[PDB]
Amino acid sequence: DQKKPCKHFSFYFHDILYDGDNVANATSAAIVSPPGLGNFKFGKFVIFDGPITMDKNYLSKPVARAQGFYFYDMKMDFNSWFSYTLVFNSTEHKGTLNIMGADLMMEPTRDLSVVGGTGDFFMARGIATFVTDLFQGAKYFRVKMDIKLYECY
Amino acid sequence: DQKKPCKHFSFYFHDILYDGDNVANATSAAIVSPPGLGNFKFGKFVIFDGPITMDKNYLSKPVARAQGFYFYDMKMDFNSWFSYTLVFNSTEHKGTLNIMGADLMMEPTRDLSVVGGTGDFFMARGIATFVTDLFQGAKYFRVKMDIKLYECY
Amino acid sequence: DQKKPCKHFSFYFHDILYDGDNVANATSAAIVSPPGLGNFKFGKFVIFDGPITMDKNYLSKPVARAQGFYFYDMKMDFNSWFSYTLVFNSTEHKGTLNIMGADLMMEPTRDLSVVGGTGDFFMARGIATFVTDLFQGAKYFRVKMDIKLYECY
Ligand SMILES: *[C@@H]1O[C@H](CO)[C@@H](O[C@@H]2O[C@H](CO)[C@@H](O[C@@H]3O[C@H](CO[C@H]4O[C@H](CO)[C@@H](O)[C@H](O)[C@@H]4O)[C@@H](O)[C@H](O)[C@@H]3O[C@@H]3OC[C@@H](O)[C@H](O)[C@H]3O)[C@H](O)[C@H]2NC(C)=O)[C@H](O)[C@H]1NC(C)=O
Ligand SMILES: *[C@@H]1O[C@H](CO)[C@@H](O[C@@H]2O[C@H](CO)[C@@H](O[C@@H]3O[C@H](CO[C@H]4O[C@H](CO)[C@@H](O)[C@H](O)[C@@H]4O)[C@@H](O)[C@H](O)[C@@H]3O[C@@H]3OC[C@@H](O)[C@H](O)[C@H]3O)[C@H](O)[C@H]2NC(C)=O)[C@H](O)[C@H]1NC(C)=O
Ligand SMILES: *[C@@H]1O[C@H](CO)[C@@H](O[C@@H]2O[C@H](CO)[C@@H](O[C@@H]3O[C@H](CO[C@H]4O[C@H](CO)[C@@H](O)[C@H](O)[C@@H]4O)[C@@H](O)[C@H](O)[C@@H]3O[C@@H]3OC[C@@H](O)[C@H](O)[C@H]3O)[C@H](O)[C@H]2NC(C)=O)[C@H](O)[C@H]1NC(C)=O
Ligand SMILES: *[C@@H]1O[C@H](CO)[C@@H](O[C@@H]2O[C@H](CO)[C@@H](O)[C@H](O)[C@H]2NC(C)=O)[C@H](O)[C@H]1NC(C)=O
Numbered sequence: 001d002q003k004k005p006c007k008h009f010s011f012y013f014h015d016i017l018y019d020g021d022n023v024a025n026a027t028s029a030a031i032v033s034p035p036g037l038g039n040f041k042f043g044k045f046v047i048f049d050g051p052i053t054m055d056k057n058y059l060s061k062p063v064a065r066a067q068g069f070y071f072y073d074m075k076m077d078f079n080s081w082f083s084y085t086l087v088f089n090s091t092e093h094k095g096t097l098n099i100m101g102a103d104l105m106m107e108p109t110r111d112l113s114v115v116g117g118t119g120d121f122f123m124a125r126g127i128a129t130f131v132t133d134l135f136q137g138a139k140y141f142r143v144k145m146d147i148k149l150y151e152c153y
Numbered sequence: 154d155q156k157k158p159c160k161h162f163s164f165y166f167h168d169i170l171y172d173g174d175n176v177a178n179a180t181s182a183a184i185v186s187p188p189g190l191g192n193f194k195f196g197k198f199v200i201f202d203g204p205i206t207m208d209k210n211y212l213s214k215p216v217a218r219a220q221g222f223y224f225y226d227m228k229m230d231f232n233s234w235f236s237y238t239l240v241f242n243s244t245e246h247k248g249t250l251n252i253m254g255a256d257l258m259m260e261p262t263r264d265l266s267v268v269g270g271t272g273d274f275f276m277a278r279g280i281a282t283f284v285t286d287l288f289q290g291a292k293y294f295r296v297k298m299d300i301k302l303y304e305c306y
Numbered sequence: 307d308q309k310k311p312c313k314h315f316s317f318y319f320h321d322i323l324y325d326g327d328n329v330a331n332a333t334s335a336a337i338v339s340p341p342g343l344g345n346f347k348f349g350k351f352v353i354f355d356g357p358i359t360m361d362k363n364y365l366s367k368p369v370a371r372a373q374g375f376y377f378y379d380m381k382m383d384f385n386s387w388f389s390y391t392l393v394f395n396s397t398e399h400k401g402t403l404n405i406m407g408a409d410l411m412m413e414p415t416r417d418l419s420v421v422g423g424t425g426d427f428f429m430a431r432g433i434a435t436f437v438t439d440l441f442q443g444a445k446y447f448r449v450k451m452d453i454k455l456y457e458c459y
């Protein structure tokens with residue numbers, strides 16, 4: 001509830017969609033075909049369990065995992081919506097952060113809500129800022145996530 | 154955390170389901186067939202990007218958009234569940250509100266949670282009240298949404 | 307925001323998946339086949355309207371209902387993710403609690419966030435702890451849910 005947060009993390013989320021042939025490498029999978037509302041994959045719904053790394057390499061030792069879903073939701077351009085949990089299980093942090101909101105893909109930056117937390121993040125609340133770092137067609141993307149907590153207990 | 158909220162909005166959400174033949178007019182689409190648990194569409198899951206208007210006309214200039222999903226979830230009557238973001242991008246408001254909860258369709262009024270907000274709505278929390286204004290078969294519905302924020306920063 | 311909560315409930319949630327042939331007994335249904343990312347049902351997505359009971363008997367008089375969804379989300383073992391509403395409509399409690407987070411099935415205990423509440427639970431926030439009480443193959447499971455509110459208005 002102010003400018004500077006009480007806890008700030010910056011790290012990278014990676015998504016490697018299952019393509020029918022890459023079980024070992026994939027971190028996510030679409031569960032439905034898009035219904036066909038426009039040409040930007042409206043309604044394509046993806047469940048993921050992806051790594052959170054401090055650098056841009058999806059093979060780096062993860063500091064957390066992101067588990068949840070996203071879907072595309074715009075008829076005339078790409079737009080998406082997310083709800084997920086960051087799961088920490090390291091000597092450094094043990095706990096979870098729950099996040100949801102609109103991933104406005106057409107914007108240079110966009111904010112989602114940190115709606116709760118557990119463990120070391122008990123009762124957290126704040127903002128999760130997304131910036132796109134890289135996308136490669138429909139096969140891979142990497143998001144820089146900046147977690148800014150404004151309630152820290 | 155009291156009777157009167159610190160910010161109160163009242164406006165209308167519109168949903169025009171994709172029917173296979175109305176790409177230009179539709180605002181939402183079902184992504185699955187209902188599995189068949191009863192006759193009230195249990196499990197039908199809809200993603201939407203619909204207009205929020207100050208009057209009851211779905212063609213009015215929107216003051217915001219609602220992006221997210223709903224699904225039906227009752228075996229013996231209609232009931233639904235929502236999670237979505239109200240996205241404001243006007244000279245008046247720029248920001249988002251994140252909302253989720255049970256849309257108890259059989260009740261004259263029902264409340265969902267405002268679980269967070271961003272931008273001009275940074276760290277908002279409160280209640281979103283739904284009343285049904287009109288439904289037309291399975292083709293269209295309009296909900297009056299009353300947003301009552303009880304934390305305003 | 308402390309050790310002892312301001313309100314604590316402990317009760318059992320029951321899930322009886324629709325199997326194609328048990329409409330009257332089922333409380334939930336999968337809406338998609340799993341896409342095939344591993345052998346632990348990654349991406350299987352289930353919508354539910356199940357009873358909340360004070361004892362372990364799914365036929366006991368419910369004290370509330372749980373309405374929402376879960377999905378499985380791990381490639382190499384079982385893991386799940388939940389978002390739902392506890393709906394109270396008794397002489398004792400009338401209101402709702404909104405809950406979401408990672409149901410870390412491989413852990414003896416795990417915590418989800420109580421992100422909001424309505425009615426008698428207006429503006430609640432806290433933690434929902436899950437422990438598995440029983441699972442029977444893929445047909446039935448029972449979770450002991452411990453609701454710990456840390457903001458009570
Ligand atoms: C697990 O999944 C990941 C993600 O999909 C796999 O990694 C991806 O692998 C592909 C190849 O299969 C790779 O694409 C190739 O990239 C090289 C390098 O491109 C970069 O460097 C160039 C300079 O050397 C630069 O000029 C480029 O702009 C890039 O920065 C290209 O030279 C190749 O042509 C190829 O590029 C692809 O070519 C086809 C085209 O359709 C496509 O758009 C284009 O991307 C990805 O870069 C790589 N991604 C990442 C994030 O590493 C990985 O192999 C999988 N692992 C297993 C075991 O399967
Ligand atoms: C985009 O989607 C919207 C929403 O689906 C489309 O608007 C809907 O269009 C239908 C016609 O296709 C229209 O239904 C018709 O309504 C008139 C008017 O009914 C009202 O006024 C009457 C008094 O004049 C009153 O007596 C009625 O009770 C209503 O208040 C009816 O006279 C027609 O018979 C028709 O009604 C439908 O008839 C068939 C029946 O199955 C159905 O239940 C019934 O609704 C909708 O009213 C209209 N909805 C809205 C919200 O405007 C719109 O055309 C689409 N646009 C494009 C470009 O495709
Ligand atoms: C609504 O759905 C519920 C949930 O699916 C149905 O209840 C389930 O019904 C099955 C039978 O269809 C029942 O399974 C049977 O359980 C008995 C009893 O087992 C317990 O007690 C034994 C001691 O008496 C103990 O030794 C066991 O370890 C158990 O504690 C078994 O003896 C049967 O063999 C059968 O067990 C099943 O056998 C096949 C095997 O594949 C399976 O894994 C195993 O479970 C469930 O226990 C019962 N569940 C609950 C929670 O009550 C109910 O009938 C449905 N109602 C309607 C109207 O259809
Ligand atoms: C968190 O990390 C711990 C450390 O490995 C995991 O638990 C240990 O898990 C291994 C299996 O990988 C067991 O063999 C050990 O007995 C566990 N040790 C203890 C002290 O519990 C745990 O499963 C991880 N939890 C996650 C990833 O959710």
Ligand SMILES: *[C@@H]1O[C@H](CO)[C@@H](O[C@@H]2O[C@H](CO)[C@@H](O)[C@H](O)[C@H]2NC(C)=O)[C@H](O)[C@H]1NC(C)=O
Nearest residue numbers: 079104105106107108110218240241242243247
């Ligand atoms: C919010 O509204 C602005 C105003 O149009 C959008 O951005 C402008 O977007 C147009 C494309 O429609 C660009 O051509 C302009 O260059 C943009 N201007 C500026 C100053 O950025 C923006 O995309 C909208 N965001 C939404 C709807 O999420």
Ligand SMILES: *[C@@H]1O[C@H](CO)[C@@H](O[C@@H]2O[C@H](CO)[C@@H](O)[C@H](O)[C@H]2NC(C)=O)[C@H](O)[C@H]1NC(C)=O
Nearest residue numbers: 232257258259260261263371393394395396400
């Ligand atoms: C909550 O419980 C009440 C009590 O039954 C439900 O409403 C009554 O609902 C019955 C239908 O079962 C109607 O015939 C009565 O007229 C209702 N009475 C009043 C005073 O409203 C209500 O539908 C339930 N709501 C839920 C389960 O969401």
